[PDB]
Design a protein around this ligand. Sequence first.
Ligand SMILES: Cn1nc(N2CCCC2)nc1/C=C/c1nc2ccc(Cl)cn2n1
Ligand SMILES: [Mg+2]
Ligand SMILES: [Zn+2]
Length: 313
Amino acid sequence: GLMQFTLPVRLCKEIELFHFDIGPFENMWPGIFVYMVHRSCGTSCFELEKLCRFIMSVKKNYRRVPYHNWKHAVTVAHCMYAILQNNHTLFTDLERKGLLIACLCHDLDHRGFSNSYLQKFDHPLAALYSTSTMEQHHFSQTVSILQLEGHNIFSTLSSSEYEQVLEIIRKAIIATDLALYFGNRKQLEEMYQTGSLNLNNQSHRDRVIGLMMTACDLCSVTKLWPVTKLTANDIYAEFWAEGDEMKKLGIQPIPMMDRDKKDEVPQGQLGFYNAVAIPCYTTLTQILPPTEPLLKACRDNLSQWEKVIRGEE
Ligand SMILES: Cn1nc(N2CCCC2)nc1/C=C/c1nc2ccc(Cl)cn2n1
Ligand SMILES: [Mg+2]
Ligand SMILES: [Zn+2]
């Protein structure tokens, strides 16, 4: 009841910044997440005993893969926490509750392979879900864990508030399918420019939360240069493993996933920053002005990748 989570002074300050790194001590990540729910939502949002048991079952259902792991889950939740705290009054009590949960759960039971690799392998999940394959699996796993005894962190919600929050989480997690991001952002671009964008339109909110989710999901490109650089090693270890598996099925992988094309990595990051990250944080800054530091940080890291190509590191 009167039990605040507190963090050491350096974390208490740095956690409020977009570029915060949650550090290498796994055992502090849960407390960090609770800390963020309590400041983002209130100490009354979730029964503490239920929250802790939910967090530990979610942790247990993330796998020991190089990038799409429990660390990523909490990194993406922290970025969401930064967006919500810098835009206090634009979001409902239910959105604040659902979106941090959505981010923690968004890659549940990820195996470190793309939707493509599942479809080419002919994995059972590709038969059950034809599009956004892993993302429908992630939502399904979230619902599974919520239905474990003592795990229903939403128990105190009404029947219809429960349905609303599970629908926020579902759309949120589906949106992390980068194939859907491209059109979602084009539409948000047009609506903002023609002035038709209306945050009382529920389908407009949906799109805006969709963009926030892409922004949080990609936030490894908005960190201080050494964090960004080192996270890129974990990202390519998955990609190259997938390429190996593509070659095992008798298919040339895309260069991205070909470990014989290591040398081209800095140019590949450039493409990604230009085709994906910059446009994402640009459109987000237009819609939610206080998110500008994500744009600024992304631009800085782009400039560091140009520096790498130019042999200046
Ligand atoms: C398109 N392309 N092509 C390449 N390569 C061509 C040959 C060598 C590199 N690399 C990319 C994108 C990399 C990439 N993709 C993501 C996704 C999420 C996050 Cl957070 C960071 N990245 N970085
Ligand atoms: Mg994902
Ligand atoms: Zn993710």
